């Protein structure tokens with residue numbers, strides 16, 4: 235997260251760290267959202283590599299023991315059938331991770347609330363991006379969970395030429411694009427939490443920023459629109 239502020243410990247308790255085994259250590263790669271005590275939602279992109287992955291719930295500082303962590307193995311990964319590694323701008327940047335165990339829910343560990351199917355937000359809707367990603371373009375990961383206020387930008391503006399054009403599809407949410415605040419690599423997979431009827435709900439799974447840089451005026455961060463996937467997400471869980 236470019237241009238963000240440290241989050242309070244308990245603000246975003248559905249945030250996870252997606253980590254891979256890196257020699258004899260574990261490194262953060264992605265975010266995600268805990269959606270069931272045994273299921274995480276992230277981006278397909280985050281699991282293109284055939285690596286050994288773990289989930290961290292209740293994470294605040296990547297490098298220090300918070301006294302609130304739970305560390306859980308990934309038992310099965312289910313990527314969207316239409317995801318293609320070579321075409322992110324096609325969309326379907328969505329994955330569901332089944333965990334090797336159910337996590338215990340407490341103040342640091344809650345489920346993410348998903349929108350109703352089909353739900354589209356109005357332009358300039360109040361949303362936050364969270365995550366441990368890079369804090370400048372070509373910079374380094376954050377140690378503590380960062381948040382940025384990132385209002386939405388509706389599809390008609392986002393798909394205009396001076397924005398993303400045709401790169402962006404109505405299966406995606408765009409948010410931000412001020413030049414100052416963004417998602418950045420390491421936030422892929424994470425949540426875009428948006429305030430609807432006085433409750434924060436996860437409308438976005440972080441997908442991409444510009445090759446030109448993370449914080450680029452009129453290049454909003456692009457999310458997979460969760461409301462487009464609710465039938466698929468339910469259909470996976472009921473059967474897996």
Ligand SMILES: *C(=O)c1cc(N)ccc1[C@@H](OC(C)=O)C(=O)OC
Nearest residue numbers: 417418419420421422440441442443
């Ligand atoms: C996501 O964590 C990530 C990581 C790496 N190494 C490259 C790209 C990405 C995505 O970044 C974000 C901000 O989502 C990405 O831009 O995918 C196209």
